[PDB]
Design a protein around this ligand. Structure first.
Ligand code: FES
Ligand code: FES
Ligand SMILES: [Fe+2]
Ligand SMILES: [Fe+2]
Ligand SMILES: [Fe+2]
Lengths: 127, 132
């Protein structure tokens, strides 16, 4: 078949063994975003120590692509400064996600969006 | 809230600890169906012994609802006769699925559809004397 899309080994790994699944009780930052197509929700929790992401968790009922991308992005964001974290997007893992069905772009965007939201929440709390 | 939707505890359980995830190499029956809206694929693999489902696996990259329903339905189908298996639908776990966002109906249909497809595959192999 021409124009094959599907699931790569990295993505599969992230699906099967996602990093940073769960919740943080009374978090410094909480972000929740929704996928406009399927309606799945993505939630990200941050603990901020120094001015860095000390801990990060995510939970979602969405699809394999959303979960793997969340695994990736939260791994990336662990230990980064808030400023660095705010600049993380799905592009930072474009290599891993290449070959995914293209409709999973929205799924992939959930993670970074939720991170951003969390950070914003934290900032506003800091007022 | 009006028109409340959400997720049950059973569905949560199935999402977190799904039964029968994976593949069967050289299966007696193979079924693959697709969700027309998101594009996710659902695959079911059966081993048939004594005109029963001896072993069953599923593989999907779809959403929590799809995965939990698959977990349920493959659990149900283990050990059933082909005839019984063909009659299993999402309705057999209607209680677990009640109140899901309505877009998850197609997600929930994937499992039983793929089961059906698998069984049909097996049957047609049998008819063609190509079964093992
Ligand atoms: S299908 Fe809903 S997040 Fe991907
Ligand atoms: S969103 Fe794709 S199977 Fe449910
Ligand atoms: Fe989108
Ligand atoms: Fe549908
Ligand atoms: Fe369907």
């Amino acid at each position: 078949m021409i124009q094959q899309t599907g699931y790569s080994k990295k993505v599969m790994e992230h699906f099967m063994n996602p990093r940073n699944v769960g919740v943080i009780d009374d978090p410094d930052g909480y972000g929740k975003v929704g996928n406009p197509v399927c309606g799945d929700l993505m939630e990200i929790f941050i603990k901020v120590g120094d001015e860095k992401i000390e801990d990060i968790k995510f939970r979602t009922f969405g699809c394999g692509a959303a979960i793997a991308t969340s695994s990736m992005i939260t791994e990336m964001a662990r230990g980064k400064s808030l400023e660095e974290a705010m600049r993380i997007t799905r592009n930072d893992v474009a290599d891993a996600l290449d070959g995914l069905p293209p409709q999973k772009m929205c799924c992939s965007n959930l993670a970074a969006d939720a991170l951003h939201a969390a950070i914003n929440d934290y900032l506003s709390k800091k007022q």
